[PDB]
Paper text:
The Scribble (Scrib) protein is a conserved cell polarity regulator with anti-tumorigenic properties. Scribble is an important regulator of cell polarity and acts as a scaffolding protein to mediate a diverse set of cellular signalling pathways via its four PDZ domains. The zoonotic Tick-born encephalitis virus TBEV encodes for the NS5 protein, which has been shown to interact with Scribble in a PDZ domain dependent manner. In summary, we show that TBEV NS5 C-terminal PBM binds SCRIB PDZ3 in order to interact with Scribble.
Author numbering:
A (entry chain B): 11 to 19, 22 to 32, 43 to 102
B (entry chain A): 11 to 31, 40 to 102
Write the structure that this text describes.
Amino acid sequence: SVEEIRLPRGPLGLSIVGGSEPGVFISKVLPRGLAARSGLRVGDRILAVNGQDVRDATHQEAVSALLRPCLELSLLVRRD
Amino acid sequence: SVEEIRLPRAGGPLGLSIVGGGVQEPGVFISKVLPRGLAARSGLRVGDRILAVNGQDVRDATHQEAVSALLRPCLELSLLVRRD
């Protein structure tokens, strides 16, 4: 399954694992935090961030894409 | 939140995927668990973190090191797992 997630972005309230081709996964989600309230779940694979493919991104690149300045923070994730 | 899981590996498909080795939380991350597969029936779940395998620390294990530890000869396959 796939879906687009927009964060109202302040801590994001999630942790991620992986990076370079396993990919980048959400390892922890703070209950009632921003990521949790946005619909992100443990185990989700982050496919893209604001249109930027991160299927093959480094852990540092994934962190940077998520914290970089933007109009709206939008993610594409794959679960199950 | 920490458990000892026994995985009776019988040579068939184990039905899980793992991600090995900013901010990190320790252990080998279980990324995928096939519903009703061997790993699922054994008690493993997505999000779990394998801390050790038969007493061997795998907190810092690479993906292959973790695979080797899970597939090497042993009498029992006992996993130390942290769960949130």
